[PDB]
Amino acid sequence: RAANDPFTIVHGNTGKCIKPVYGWIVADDCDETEDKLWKWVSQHRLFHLHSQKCLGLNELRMFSCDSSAMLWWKCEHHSLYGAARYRLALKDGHGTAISNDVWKKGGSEESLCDQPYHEIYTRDGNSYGRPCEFPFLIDGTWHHDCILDEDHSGPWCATTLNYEYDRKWGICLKPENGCEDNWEKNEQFGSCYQFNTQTALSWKEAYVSCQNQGADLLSINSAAELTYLKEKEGIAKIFWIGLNQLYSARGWEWSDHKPLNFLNWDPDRPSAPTIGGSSCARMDAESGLWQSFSCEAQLPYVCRKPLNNTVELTDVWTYSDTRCDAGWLPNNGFCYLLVNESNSWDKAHAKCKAFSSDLISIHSLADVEVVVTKLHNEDIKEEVWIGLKNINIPTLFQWSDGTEVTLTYWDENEPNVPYNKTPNCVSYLGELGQWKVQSCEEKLKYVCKRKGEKLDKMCPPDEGWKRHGETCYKIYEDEVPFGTNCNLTITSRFEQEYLNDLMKKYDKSLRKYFWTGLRDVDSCGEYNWATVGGRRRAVTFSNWNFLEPASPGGCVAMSTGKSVGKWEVKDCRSFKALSICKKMSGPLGPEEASPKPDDPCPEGWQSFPASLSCYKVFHAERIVRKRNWEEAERFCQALGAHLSSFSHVDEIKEFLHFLTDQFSGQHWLWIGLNKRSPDLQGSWQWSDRTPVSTIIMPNEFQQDYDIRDCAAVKVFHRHFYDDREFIYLRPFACDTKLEWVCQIPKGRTPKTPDWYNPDRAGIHGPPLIIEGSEYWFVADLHLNYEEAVLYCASNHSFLATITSFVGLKAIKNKIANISGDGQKWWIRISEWPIDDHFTYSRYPWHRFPVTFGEECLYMSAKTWLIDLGKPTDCSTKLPFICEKYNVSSLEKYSPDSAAKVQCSEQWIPFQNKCFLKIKPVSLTFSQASDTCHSYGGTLPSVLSQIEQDFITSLLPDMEATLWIGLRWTAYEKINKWTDNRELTYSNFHPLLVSGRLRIPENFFEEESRYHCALILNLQKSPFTGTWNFTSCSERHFVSLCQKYSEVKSETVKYLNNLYKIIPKTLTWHSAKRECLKSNMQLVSITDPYQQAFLSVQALLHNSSLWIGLFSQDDELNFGWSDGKRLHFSRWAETNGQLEDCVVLDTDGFWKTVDCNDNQPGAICYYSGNETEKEVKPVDSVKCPSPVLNTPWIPFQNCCYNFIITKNRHMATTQDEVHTKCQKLNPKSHILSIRDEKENNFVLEQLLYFNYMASWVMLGITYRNKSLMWFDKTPLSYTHWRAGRPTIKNEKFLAGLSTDGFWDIQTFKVIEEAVYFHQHSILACKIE
């Protein structure tokens, strides 16, 4: 389990207590804690359970923590420091900061920081399982734990910071003693289940949620459990199963420690080996099939707790020096032997079965230890059979002779059960002796095992001396100092497990440590084994505790209570621990030097002579795009390398000093360290199977330390390591050994012949596609989506983006002529050319925690009109085509420099251009053209973001619509920008203008209408400045013309606001102090007008300036220094908030930097003319009881139920869905949106399930020859994609999409639109 326990603060120098009262700190008088209790809460704050106030600051006092008054503390060595190098101290009883003491727990010896913050998750509600956020304010009272009232279901908490303004709650998930409440005390069989649906949680988050309750994730071991999970009523259609491979070199493991014998892998997944693959599994409940999906997603899960669990063990680590039949290797009473002759599986089984033996069987780590240590150096170059076969359907591995499987040791990463294969065989490979699949038809060696009979003064066990087979172990009575007579050195994990069993058998209670000969004599941070004289055995194995490395000096010991064998670090000066040793050692173990410091790098890899390894760094501009930790590791493995993993503590600083020369700005990089695997139990590990031995990470008391399990390194332009999640995108740097060769799997470098042969072949034969650049048709080479994108993307070439219907028809004809009407091709279909730099996938109303998936599309030669907006399983090998970039920044025109340069008083100048305003009179586009031509210039053409910001800042005084002035023929691309300028970017919000491709009527002789664009002034809406396209035969207002001018390329008042640009180079705290010195505060941008004005003002200064945006919750939730809700945001990236404080870049985007830095300016604001902050939502609607684990979320006098559950009845869905919503709960019909805010609410609820559902079913019919809802009511409000539909029949499916638009799929056969039914949600409102 895991929970936060209330504690007390104790001083170290003066060994007494703490006492907060209304005014200040007073005399302790504690040891009667009925009047004081402290607990850590969010934002690194301390909360008192008695006064219900949070401590803060320079007089220290208890303030209500609904304020921004530097209410946060940090984790020092053994003390606490505040905002900027502050400190916490007391003087004569009263506490006051000192800025230069230690504080420990009550009844313990640690700095209030060693135990990580264990947050709790929620089960169901309007939050979808998001973790709690304590404290929360209700009825004027601050609650720090889950409450229990007669209104809600059970223990429920608030999941966000401000509960009053969000009204998002969730039923808590607390550890229970039995499986009676919120569980199912019986299952199939011998466990209790908890099916929590509607919870968009990642794999690691779901595992942490199931583990905090003492249980674990799912575990399927027999077909009975599978068929019980299939026929369960309240279960999600797709969820997690805990099956994962998050280790370095392990095949596939269960979440809980259970053997993997029953496999149900989907036969459609091609099992992408390195790029495009995954490491966590996923279960589909409709067919009950297993897939390998990228477990960075957000899918529901299910917890499983063993019913009446018992701690049963055995004598798995014993000793028996028995003899065998003169040649059979004896080990622990058994005899193993492998035949050197080539044989099959069944034939060899029958061969060595005729003796008094049969094929080998591995039940625990003893057999694995035998297989690895013996067998001629773990069978360096060999393949050996093993008596595990499968003939059942589904797959269920079983031993040749046995009763039950108990340990599975797979090879990373291929259990690899074929589709059409009745016999399934396993074999040995790898330096760790792991298992892979075979065909029971290859000729390779085999091993088998015999039960032998039971049977020197060099090792007398008379004095309590245990034996292991080659080297005995001996424990001593007591030893206070370190290494009194002996120090122990461990070499591998099997020796560690033997030592753990010996320690558990020796002692009977907890809190007795055993010494270990690992220390740092030089106090250099790197740990090495103690030298007993002429011994320099390097560290080959390491297993620390959760966060053990904390001091660059000390001595290690081994705990035995629950952290069995975890190498803890204690003071090597004075600390008592027991001692264990061995007699023999390894003479040939540390005698090996494989790398050589004289071998150079193969090609292009840079390295310094003090590295013995070649490096290859991937900058943030050369690559196709940044990627997550797992994607970076897979990209490094594809090239034959891994992430940078240093052995010594000087190599890290040398590598940092070597990379900081290749960088100008500061940006994080990926590293091999990660604690993602559940078997590590919190300890770190290197991805290349190298034991961690140095202090690399500090101890930051983060709120989600269990979730962020990846290590990121920071470079400076002058060794700071942080813990990032496995979802953030980040550049990386692979590294290879000085003697090993790299790989080239059709990626970056092996494009060298792919830049000459196919490029010229496509430039010669294939002509230019109609209305577009050249398209190279990469066929006869099937690659995944990630591999196709990596192949197409180059210095100029990239993945083919289709934005026109003419180009669509051309590529369709070329595909039909080249490959056929059956093959599929990877195409990125859109309406306007999208920029890979700015994804524009930012929600405008709120920043809710949902990571959207990848939109990897496809298209075929036939059925292209239907499958153009349907995503596929893009871990598939298919041909593709690559497009070519043209000369963008190479065209030069406008030779007139001093003649046309004329900026009069009716002209506002900006960067290399100038604008002029006219009256807001209304004219069409063809008239507005000559209206601007009446003056000298052109219509306003936008080529960058800051020009759009300048236009937006000029917009408030203009009309509600402006003619931007770019025209294009309908159903084609956009060019010429009315001024012979290449279209760089376009600002079309996908929530207002449908980003999908437009499909016209296929019968049009010459009716080629034109489409023009305009800028909207949406009157306080967050979409002002965006562009909208329309048939410009109509007329709109015109208030702007642009021209080019060459020779001439304080307290500011703006929209009832006073802005001051401080040019001082200072931090964010000093900036806030300087703003407060002028009776002002840091600017809080709450509207796009202020954002655009501040952006153009920052461009006028050519440097990024500070703003009033900062974070306290470990960069999870941002907020303004004024106490204003973050509603408007213009971040530069989706997941780019990598540091704490915020600055406003010159390009108009909010950059994020750690505000312990120097920025060349800041922005202070003052609001005196307009001071309005009165906003409070009212929620007085209570929904009925939840049904089938699907609650009713209230919204505006209604109760919606997005039924994400097993449903396959798709026969006459019109009445079927209605009866389904009816018998589920009366007084509730199908969903029918009749407003605009309701559509946004439905879209928000859909976006939480964007990984398993892309549409929400709507109740649209065609009764009485008109589109109307199921109820007797007309259809007032509608949100279509492109015009009103033309549905004449009544057989069609209406679905609210993931962009707010309503799509309609018509069909003639009911069994043809099942793809729309598989990805739909059945919502039944109440009203």
Ligand SMILES: *[C@@H]1O[C@H](CO)[C@@H](O[C@@H]2O[C@H](CO)[C@@H](O[C@@H]3O[C@H](CO)[C@@H](O)[C@H](O)[C@@H]3O)[C@H](O)[C@H]2NC(C)=O)[C@H](O)[C@H]1NC(C)=O
């Ligand atoms: C962005 O531009 C598009 C134009 O392509 C705008 O779509 C147009 O919006 C108007 C306003 O609602 C529609 O007029 C309505 O037509 C229905 C047809 O049944 C009629 O019943 C209403 O009384 C009203 O006249 C118009 O049909 C629609 N489409 C076109 C081609 O003009 C869109 O509104 C613009 N976006 C924003 C935010 O204004």
Ligand SMILES: *[C@@H]1O[C@H](CO)[C@@H](O)[C@H](O)[C@H]1NC(C)=O
């Ligand atoms: C809900 O009902 C109350 C009282 O009938 C009404 O004041 C309120 O406007 C309703 N909500 C909406 C969104 O109309």
